[PDB]
Scaffold this active site. Structure first.
Site, PDB file in Angstrom:
ATOM      1  N   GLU A 291     -11.390  -0.134  -3.667  1.00  0.00           N
ATOM      2  CA  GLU A 291     -10.712   0.505  -2.539  1.00  0.00           C
ATOM      3  C   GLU A 291      -9.498   1.289  -3.020  1.00  0.00           C
ATOM      4  O   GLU A 291      -9.222   1.327  -4.232  1.00  0.00           O
ATOM      5  CB  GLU A 291     -10.292  -0.531  -1.511  1.00  0.00           C
ATOM      6  CG  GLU A 291      -9.028  -1.296  -1.876  1.00  0.00           C
ATOM      7  CD  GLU A 291      -8.610  -2.240  -0.753  1.00  0.00           C
ATOM      8  OE1 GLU A 291      -8.137  -1.784   0.321  1.00  0.00           O
ATOM      9  OE2 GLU A 291      -8.753  -3.450  -0.942  1.00  0.00           O
TER      10      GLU A 291
ATOM     11  N   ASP B   8       0.784  -1.238   0.000  1.00  0.00           N
ATOM     12  CA  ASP B   8       0.000   0.000   0.000  1.00  0.00           C
ATOM     13  C   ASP B   8       0.821   1.297   0.000  1.00  0.00           C
ATOM     14  O   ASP B   8       0.570   2.195   0.816  1.00  0.00           O
ATOM     15  CB  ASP B   8      -0.916   0.031   1.226  1.00  0.00           C
ATOM     16  CG  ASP B   8      -1.684  -1.272   1.444  1.00  0.00           C
ATOM     17  OD1 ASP B   8      -2.132  -1.926   0.449  1.00  0.00           O
ATOM     18  OD2 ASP B   8      -1.854  -1.650   2.636  1.00  0.00           O
TER      19      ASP B   8
END
Ligand SMILES: [Ca+2]
Length: 325
Positions: free
Chosen positions: A218, A21
């Site tokens: 997301e 991420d």
């Protein structure tokens, strides 16, 4: 799929810990990366900050800068974070889970890009779900984008309110989009309740809940280029980073295409950052861990905008590779 390790276009940026991420920023003349830290299940507990001094440099691990034990309101699952700067402070935004099982977004403040960071005792009011991204708009404003469905819990919210019976839309119902709110000048509070960011198809119609190739899943990220805003995001079960464009940070954004083809490991997550002459895509995959979804490594590849504003698809193992998904 062992061929994919061999034709990967990027090496792991670091291999002494697992990272995911990646949120990349240029702060104070260097590239700082704020990723998740996978522990050897998504039970992450802490954040490191990484730095590249200049284009081509070795990546420095500046060490651990925040741990969930120092976050009074959160119990577990320190997921995809981001950072911002204002008034000489650096802010670390991060999603984490309360003891009652709800994700929310909190912030920690430091005096430098590398910390140490001191976490606020409560999360940011008005936030929920996961995957914050903070856009430093060229006009001086900062905007917080967030959201993730499935494990991210966004599907339980409408108009910023939680309900147990709120579920993911299906069929011809508009898919959910990420949320956005202008941040207050004090950066640790929203300036307004968050709004729905709408993503449109080529006909101007909001994407359908049953269009999993394109609808938001997301990890929103926004960057500015050539006088427009680029919203890019993970599609989850179809394993793409897609992007869409708008003349406004609020949208609506019109779907453009696929920015990153599927990676090894189930998740895909990214950021897009300009460093000196060049745009870069930061992303992750699970090759380092031998294909384990929950043990990732961050990567970077150069990114290019075409004359017409589009971004060509990046193929992380080459265009000729067998797709992992
Ligand atoms: Ca992110």
């Amino acid at each position: 799929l062992q061929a994919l390790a061999r034709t990967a276009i990027s090496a792991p940026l670091v291999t002494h810990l697992y990272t995911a991420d990646p949120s990349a920023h240029v702060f104070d003349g260097a590239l700082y990366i704020y990723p998740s830290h996978d522990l050897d299940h998504f039970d992450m507990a802490d954040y490191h900050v990484l730095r590249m001094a200049h284009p081509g440099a070795a990546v420095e691990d500046l060490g651990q800068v925040l741990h969930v034990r120092d976050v009074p309101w959160a119990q577990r699952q320190m997921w995809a974070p981001d950072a911002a700067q204002r008034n000489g402070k650096t802010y670390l935004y991060f999603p984490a889970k309360r003891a009652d099982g709800m994700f929310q977004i909190g912030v920690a403040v430091g005096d430098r890009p590398e910390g140490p960071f001191v976490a606020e005792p409560q999360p940011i009011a008005g936030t929920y779900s996961i995957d914050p991204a903070v856009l430093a708009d060229d006009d001086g404003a900062h905007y917080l984008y967030f959201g993730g469905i499935w494990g991210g819990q966004l599907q339980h919210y409408r108009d910023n309110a939680y309900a147990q019976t709120h579920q993911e839309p299906v069929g011809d119902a508009p898919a959910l989009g990420p949320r956005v709110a202008r941040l207050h000048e004090r950066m640790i509070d929203l300036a307004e309740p968050s709004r729905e960011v709408v993503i449109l198809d080529e006909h101007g119609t909001p994407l359908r809940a049953d269009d999993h190739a394109r609808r938001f899943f997301e990890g929103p990220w926004v960057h500015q280029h050539a006088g427009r805003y680029y919203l890019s995001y993970s599609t989850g079960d179809t394993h793409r980073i897609c992007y869409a464009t708008s003349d406004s940070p609020y949208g609506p954004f019109t779907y453009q295409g696929v920015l990153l083809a599927p990676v090894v490991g189930w998740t895909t997550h990214h950021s897009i950052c300009l460093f000196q002459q060049q745009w870069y895509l930061f992303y992750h995959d699970s090759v380092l861990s031998g294909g384990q979804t929950h043990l990732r490594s961050i990567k970077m590849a150069p990114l290019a905008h075409a004359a017409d504003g589009t971004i060509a698809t990046i193929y992380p193992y080459g265009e000729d590779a067998v797709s992992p998904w």
